Amino acid sequence: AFAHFVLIHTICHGAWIWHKLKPLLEALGHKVTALDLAASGVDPRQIEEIGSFDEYSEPLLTFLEALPPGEKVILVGESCGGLNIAIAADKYCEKIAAAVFHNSVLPDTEHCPSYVVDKLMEVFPDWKDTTYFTYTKDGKEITGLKLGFTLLRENLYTLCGPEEYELAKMLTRKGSLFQNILAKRPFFTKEGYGSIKKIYVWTDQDEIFLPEFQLWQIENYKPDKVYKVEGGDHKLQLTKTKEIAEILQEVADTYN
């Protein structure tokens, strides 16, 4: 079967991390949309204009709103992208055939929206040469960050080529986890987000979303299906592009 995949990047990244996976999925016959979220990739906004993870998710929400009745997509979110999936699923669950988490955070419905992020910051507290700043938006102080080049090299793009790591130094932009905003956000709902099919893809070789964090998430909120990719790194759509496309073909064949 063929599906319409909507690939969702993580904070500080853009559609560009999917540049190897998107042609591979199209060569299997799939339709693929790779979005730039707010203030991400070549989106015109700067991060200081964005006051929450929900505002950050506007390109994804606008995309789903534009789908005609009856058209369903499979959302694919990497790293912090699981939070965009959860926000989207609480507004457009009828339009989501399934959600695939790719070395991704997996929010739940029983604890606050920041819960899994608070746990990630406990398991991985040192983001090395990453710099931080603050800005004010809608009466709240938001902590912005710019991913450090050594963190990018060693923990996110560990086994990626020098030309792939070069794209990350050139294209990663200022972003935010909006952690304190997620902590006061209304919980994700059981009827929206809780109802969607959730496929969790990961590798135990991920150097930032470590096995203790990812196995903790799998135990916290049981996925419908789990795929473990052997080897690779945190950016599996770059180091294991073929294996991710094979898993996504199986999801397209299982969930519609």
From Swiss-Prot:
What does UniProt give as the signal peptide span? none
Q: Which residues bind 2-hydroxy-2-methylpropanenitrile?
A: 10, 79, 235
Which chain positions carry the site (Increases basicity of active site His)?
206
Known regulation of its activity is: Inhibited by hexafluoracetone and rhodanide (thiocyanate). Also inhibited by trichloroacetaldehyde via a covalent link on Ser-79. Susceptible to several serine, histidine and cysteine inhibitors: is strongly inhibited by diisopropyl fluorophosphate, diethyl pyrocarbonate, HgCl(2) and parachloromercuribenzoate (PCMB), to a lesser extent by iodoacetamide (IAAM) and iodoacetic acid (IAA), but barely by AgNO(3) and PbNO(3).
Question: What reactions does this protein catalyze?
Answer: a monosubstituted aliphatic (S)-hydroxynitrile = an aldehyde + hydrogen cyanide; a disubstituted aliphatic (S)-hydroxynitrile = a ketone + hydrogen cyanide; an aromatic (S)-hydroxynitrile = an aromatic aldehyde + hydrogen cyanide; 2-hydroxy-2-methylpropanenitrile = acetone + hydrogen cyanide
Q: Name the active site residues.
A: 79 (proton donor/acceptor), 234 (proton donor/acceptor)
- Post-translational modification comment from the UniProt entry: The N-terminus is blocked.
Give an example GO molecular function: methyl salicylate esterase activity
GO terms (BP aspect):
jasmonic acid metabolic process; salicylic acid metabolic process
Q: Name one Pfam family in it.
A: Abhydrolase_1
Enzyme nomenclature, EC number: 4.1.2.47
Residues engaged in binding acetone: 10, 79
Task: List its uses.
Answer: This enzyme can be used as a biocatalyst for stereoselective synthesis of a wide array of (S)-cyanohydrins by addition of HCN to aldehydes or ketones. Optically active cyanohydrins are interesting intermediates for the synthesis of alpha-hydroxy acids, alpha-hydroxy ketones, or beta-ethanolamines, all of which are important building blocks in organic synthesis.
This protein's assembly is summarised as:
Homodimer or homotetramer.
State the protein's name: (S)-hydroxynitrile lyase
Supply the source organism for this entry: Hevea brasiliensis
Starting at the broadest rank, the lineage of the source organism is:
Eukaryota, Viridiplantae, Streptophyta, Embryophyta, Tracheophyta
